[PDB]
Each structure stands twice: as structure tokens, then as C-alpha cells.
């Protein structure tokens, strides 16, 4: 007779693989999206299994299933082809079917029909041939890293990568890799995030690139934890992670990352060793009255004295019984905030504190272990709020009739905590500032407050506050 | 000596942390009273009691020294301070000691003391704290607490959210010939709870409790069945358990025979499996864009049961169920799923009885054989030639009296605004009454709505 198919996608599917796929892919969605096409989910029914890709442009995820996993038959394939449904929506039935077994079937007019059971859902599909298509990748020169090491890299340096959308190249990780040996690098300007990884590559290739901090979060929640190894792929532009079943892309960020190797303080001349735990729970008590500032206290033989007090609401003191302590006496003030995300990262039992005074940066590391650094830049105290340093300071130009006037106000400045440097002419670097801003904020203020010396701070400081 | 009154004592953390957990729920964030903010604590040869409250509902709760053949607080001072509730309560969380010592030190000043942790917090004076309400506390109604909590898990969700109108936030209690009757009213739906009390055949009473109220009086309250004392006075409630009481402002107002609407009568009797027809409607519901959803079900005897949903621009579902027994007239209905799903998981059993009597009438679910428990709801009135085709209708209707110039005005051109999908009444004077709206309209927010629009 005449052929004309009753369907143009039709297969048979475990719901278990089905969600635990969808669940990945799902992470590369994001609603608010300029693109329409990319708020659906593309599948891709072949006769080898069905594979999920969903993407927001900037990240990509396709993940695969092949159609036998065993002895078990995963997915039966009755009619190859394509189609996009609503990721989200397509999320939420699949998690609720009641039912092993799922039957997708995608109608002549791209309805596509979802059974479970004696449950039917009937979906809206967009034709697969819309959907973009994943970077263009070739696998060479590319690099291994075992999983649990790679989470581990990424977990020890996420957190630290700024969320300001200032410095776009700051709110990703700078990846550089020399001599065989992967340097992973994240700061916001309050702290920095180091740590290192020996990789068995030639020594020969070069790598400096910046991974935006969520793909490498949101990788990390894809990858399971084993020792086998995650296939890595640099190029220009993107990055390439792939594992059992699981393509991952992630869009670099365009520029140069900050030099900070010349940063990292060499030397330093008090070294405290303290038990991580309680170490940890005292500082966190001491967060309790952020109303924001911790001050640390030690001295060589002696107890460590860890204290805040917040105005009119309270204070609070506690002491540790420390491990080892040598060199200068002490009395330094932090944000607690730092100090813990540094803490909650370290494995060890007992952590190592290096300090070069109090208005210098500490390191906080473990104690035979060259491979993490955690650094954090204190807060000054005088006696003219508190004041917390930039490890990347930021830059302001500025007009001639504007550039002039921040030189004439720029006592009162100093007062606010605008600590301005004036290293550019026309414009002045941003050394110091209130330690009271909100993170992730700090150039927007300080760009306001300036404004106003333009445009005309007691009562204006005051209804910010 | 003989005037200073500093307190001190050292409790151990796990019950510090219990009590001031439960009076916390009673501290207010937004008061007009400043005390308010705080805990009132207060040590005796007794124990120590901790104090929270927000005017207008007020919760004490108790750790005696002892407890049984146990040591649980040593007060070497009496004494009483109020703290800041929140900082407290955040405090003795992280307490690295089991052990926690709380003395005031001078006027102005509180610390605690657990393990090597020292924390110096503002105490004020508890005189300034205002006292509990005077309870007559005479007459009394005892409930296991088991039935209680279950009671109040049975209606509170069914109560009104629109402070509009304030009555219909609370649970309305009616007790008459040693019966308590607890009935929630809300936009679109009621619940109604019947419990048997042990009281004399005499003592009535009918008062309206916040909604808010009985919440957290469940959640402080433990898994037994131990007894529950509650008086009833003219103007507040009082929760008595084992070392812990709990205060309600009553509220004011005569509460609608909204009762009235539950028959006696259907056309349509289905009984099926609790579960699958939870699940069923949960999974119909899944439609909803999310930014309100409507479920149709469709029964006819000897034949599965059919669940649906139509959300266009999206997709559709459809759901069959086998019912353990469908009896009576054939049935299409439609009904906003939020509803009917609350009715459900606040049904024990493995099946449930929804009786019917048209697509149109408010439909009841209940457990067969049992009318301790009434679930009450109006259905989506579907119009297919209309502009709304989905229509909702209200248990309590809205009012709306404006003044003459803006009353006689819109009421030239009366059908002007009800196009949009609105329909409206005239009665009294210079005023209207809406029994209806689109299903498409905010929950909690129907009478704002219609009030901007108007």
C-alpha cells in the first residue's frame, strides 16, 4: 500500500533513568531566558537509546541513556526521532508517574503523548530542528581529572568567586595549568580561593582560562562520587567536561584573569594550630551577634580569645584551648562570614592560621598540605567605622570637572570610608571601604556616594543605612 | 541580702531549648510593643518559667528542678529577667555544653555561660513585662491531645486568608448538649469537626479562636493522649497542658450559619481509594502555569472514574481510577484542585465518600459511614457559550456600599465592569452584593480585586 507513519517519535522508557536524566538536564534550563526555544528540552530518540540536552547558552548538558544497561531492556526505541517539550513542566510529570514503565509517543502534529499507568499527559512539542545545536567541539589536547578530586577542586573554590556583576571575569575560576599541575584560583576582593591539583598530562601544554562558578557548581551536582575520570576539553571559548552518559559545556569568560600569586604573603610571623571543629563552632557563636566583625586575640602558651559585641544588643567571648602557637602577639578583626566559608571547606581534623599582623592578610591551610590555600583580608579597626581592603581594588574614571572635586571633598571621604587611593589621574582605585557594606554591592555604593558630591552624606549615609 | 533579686541558676540545654522554642512561636517581630520583643524569664524554688507573647496570644512555658527522679535545673538565685527572644533562642541552639548558666550580673545586664563561652546580653526588668489575662478559669473542658491536634489539623487550613474580613480567619467553636462543633469557613470551601466532649448536657458556648492560634498551639503541642483543660471566657481562650499554658484572644462578632450549606441529599455517590485519587488529582493539577487550575472529574456506575485537565497553550491530562462503588446519577464536575486536595490529606482512612447532586451544587467529602468530619466545597460552574467560562462562587458574599455620587454613577452602567468577568447584586441601598467570580482570580485576594477594578 502507501506508507504514512502513524507518529513521528515513539519509544518505551524506565521512569527511574527517565527523571534521574531529566533532573541533569533540567540544571542547564533557566527561565528567564531571551531565547524561547531554550525554556524546552530536547530529546532524541535514536536507535542506540534517547538522549536529553538542555541549555541556556551559556551552559549546555546532554545526557544519554542507552537502551540496554544489562540484562534489563532501559528504553525500546519502536520509532526513532525528535522533539522538544517544556523542560520544566516535562520535569514536574515525569517525578509523578505513577508507574515503571513510560511510554512517550510524539503525534503527526507534534502533540506528544506521555503514559504512565492510567495516567496520560498530552504535551506541546516544538519541532527538535529548532533547537541549537551543541558546540562544536574537537576532543584534543584534552586533560583528566578524577571525579571526586575535580568536586573537590571545585568545592574548595567555588564559593569564593565574587557575585558582583562589576568585574564579570571575578564572578568565575581561573583554571591555569603549567607544567602538569592544574592552579585553580577564585576571589571576590574580600578573599581568595587557591588550590592546586598534580594531573598526568605533558608538561608541555598551557592552559589560562576563567569557568563561570555556577557551571562548576552545577556540574558538580551532575557528576557522581567516584574515582574514575571526567574527560576535560579546553578550547577558546568553551570548556568541555565528559563522563558516563553525560556531556557538559560551559561558555568561558571572555578577558584576563587578576595576577595574585605576588599576593599570597610568604612569610609570616604568628602560626597558630587549633582543632578545626572547635575552632569552627567558636567563630560561629561569635557570628550570632551580626546584628558582622570578629576580633581574634592569641598569644604563644596561652588560650586563643575570640570575641564581637554588637552596640546596645550584647557581647560575647569564648576560648579555645589552641594546639600550638608561635611568634607575635595578636589582636586582629575579621568578617566571621569569610572565616567560615574558608573553615567548612578544610578536611583536616586541625587547621594552620598564618598571620603578618593585623592589617595584613592570614592564610588558613591545613597542616602538611602545600595543595589549599584559603586567604582573607582583615578588617581595620580604628578606634570612622571599621574598614575592610580590597584584594582587587576597584577602578573609577572620571570627568576633569568631576576629578577635580573628589580631591577637594576628599577628607570628608576618608571620614565616610571612602578610602580612595588616587593612583589614576582621573581617577582614583578603591583600596579600603566600609566594612558594613553588603556583599556584592560595594562599587554601587561607593559609585552613589561620590554622585552626590557631584550633585550637591550625614542624612543621606543615614537613610541608606 | 535583704533587697537585691539577681537571678541565677544553671538548666541543661536540651529543655532550655524546648521551652524557648515554644514561646517563641508566640513573640511578635512587627509589635507596637517593645517589651514585647523580648522573653520573659522567671526563676523560682519551683523552677524556671519562660514567658512569650504578642497581645494576643500569650504561651508560658515550665521546667520544674526536678522531674521525676531527675535534676533538671539548680537555682542557686530566684529571679526574673525578659531577654531578646530571637538572639536567645539563637544562642542556646549553638550552646557547646549541655549544662548553660544564666545570671544577671547588674541592673542592665544578662549573661550566659556554657562550657567556654561567655555571652553578655541587655536583660530588662520584668516588671515592665505585662502580666498574663485574668482568667476567671472556673468552668473547664477536657481533650486528649491527640483528638485536639487532630481536630485543630481538620478545619484550620479551611479558614479565611483576607483580613477584610476578620471573623472568617478563625475557626468558629460551638459547643451544645456536650458536643463540640469546630467549623472553618473559607472563599470557595468549609470544613466542619465534630467531637464528643465529657461535660454536663447544660454548659454551651460559642466562640471564634484565630486560626493563627490553634496552629501554633499544635505545634507545641506533644504526640499523646494526655488531657487538655480549656477555658472559655467571654473574650479569651486558655490551652492548659503539662507545664505549659497557652492564651488566645477570642475573636469578636457572630459567626455566619455557613453549616447551612452542607445537605443531606445527593444524586452521585462515589466511594474510592484514598490514595489513588489523592494522587490522581495531584497529578491533573500539575498543569497550572504556576503564575488558577481547574480539574474536572466524570463518573458513571460501572466505570472507571475520570480525572482531567485542559490548560491550553500547554497541554492537557487525563487520569482514570477504579472506585470501590459509584452510585446514582451520571456525573461531569469541575472543581479548583487546591481544594479538594486539602480535603483529602486531611482525611484518614483508605477510602473517602464525595457525595454529588449536579455539577453545580457544592459537593461534600467525607469517610464513609462517618460524620465526625465534613469537607465541604463549591464547585467551577462552567458556562460554555460565556466569555468566563469558569466560574467560582462564593460561600459568604462580598459587600460593597460607596458613596451616592460613585454608588449611582456605576450603577447607570452597572453592566459596564461586569463584563470582564465579574457578576454583581443590588441590595439594600446604594450597595452590592457579589456571589460570583472567574476562576482565574487570586485566592485570598477575590474582594481587592474586584474593589480596584470597581
Known amino acids: 500500500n502507501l506508507y504514512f507513519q502513524s507518529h513521528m517519535m515513539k519509544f518505551t522508557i524506565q521512569k527511574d533513568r527517565l527523571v534521574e536524566s531529566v533532573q541533569d538536564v533540567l540544571k542547564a534550563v533557566s527561565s528567564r531566558t531571551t531565547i524561547p526555544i531554550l525554556t524546552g528540552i530536547k530529546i532524541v530518540a535514536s536507535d542506540d537509546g534517547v538522549s536529553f540536552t538542555g541549555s541556556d547558552s551559556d551552559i549546555s548538558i546532554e545526557s544519554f541513556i542507552p537502551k540496554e544497561e544489562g540484562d534489563k531492556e ?12 517544556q523542560a520544566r513542566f516535562f520535569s514536574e510529570i515525569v517525578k509523578k508517574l505513577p508507574m515503571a514503565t513510560v ?38 589536547h584534552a586533560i583528566q581529572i578524577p571525579t571526586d578530586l575535580l568536586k573537590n577542586l571545585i568545592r574548595q573554590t567555588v564559593f569564593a568567586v565574587s557575585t558582583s556583576e562589576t568585574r564579570p571575569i571575578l564572578t568565575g575560576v581561573n583554571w591555569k595549568v603549567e607544567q602538569s599541575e592544574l592552579l585553580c584560583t577564585a576571589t571576590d576582593s574580600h578573599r581568595l580561593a587557591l588550590r592546586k591539583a598534580k594531573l598526568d598530562i605533558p ?19 551532575i557528576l557522581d562520587d567516584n574515582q574514575e575520570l571526567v574527560d576535560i ?53 561569635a557570628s550570632l551577634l551580626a546584628r558582622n566583625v570578629v576580633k581574634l586575640s592569641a598569644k604563644p602558651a596561652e588560650s586563643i580569645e575570640i570575641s564581637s559585641n554588637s552596640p546596645e544588643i550584647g557581647k560575647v567571648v569564648e576560648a579555645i584551648v589552641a594546639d600550638q602557637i608561635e611568634g607575635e602577639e595578636l589582636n586582629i578583626s575579621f568578617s566571621p ?129
Open 74 to 85: 532501559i528504553v525500546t526505541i519502536e520509532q526513532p526521532g525528535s522533539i522538544v517539550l
Open 103 to 140: 511510554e512517550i509517543e510524539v503525534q503527526n502534529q507534534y502533540l506528544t503523548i506521555i503514559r504512565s499507568g492510567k495516567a496520560e499527559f498530552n504535551l506541546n512539542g516544538l519541532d527538535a530542528d529548532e533547537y541549537p545545536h551543541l558546540p562544536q567541539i574537537e576532543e584534543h
Open 203 to 221: 608538561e608541555d601544554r598551557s592552559y589560562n582560562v576563567v569557568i563561570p562558578g555556577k557551571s562548576l557548581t552545577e556540574l558538580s551536582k
Open 233 to 285: 576539553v579546553i578550547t577558546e571559548t568553551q570548556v568541555l567536561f565528559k563522563a558516563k552518559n553525560v556531556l557538559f559545556f560551559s561558555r568561558l569568560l571572555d578577558g584576563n584573569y587578576p595576577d595574585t600569586t605576588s599576593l599570597i604573603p610568604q612569610d609570616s610571623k604568628t602560626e597558630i594550630i587549633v582543632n578545626t571543629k572547635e575552632f569552627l563552632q567558636a567563630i560561629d557563636r
Open 337 to 465: 562570614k569569610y572565616m567560615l566559608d574558608a573553615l567548612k571547606v578544610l578536611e583536616g581534623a586541625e587547621i594552620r592560621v598564618s598571620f603578618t599582623g593585623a592589617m595584613r592578610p592570614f592564610l588558613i591551610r591545613t597542616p602538611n598540605d602545600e595543595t589549599i590555600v584559603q586567604l582573607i583580608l582583615p578588617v581595620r579597626t580604628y578606634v570612622e567605622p571599621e574598614v575592610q581592603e580590597m584584594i582587587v581594588p576597584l577602578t573609577f574614571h572620571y570627568s576633569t570637572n568631576e576629578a577635580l572635586i573628589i580631591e577637594q571633598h576628599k577628607q570628608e571621604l576618608e571620614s565616610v570610608g571612602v578610602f580612595l587611593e588616587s593612583f589614576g589621574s582621573n581617577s582614583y582605585i578603591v583600596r579600603c571601604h566600609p566594612a558594613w557594606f553588603p556583599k556584592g554591592e560595594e562599587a554601587e555604593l561607593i559609585e552613589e556616594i561620590i554622585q552626590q558630591v557631584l550633585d550637591s552624606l550625614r542624612e543621606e549615609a543615614a537613610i541608606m543605612m
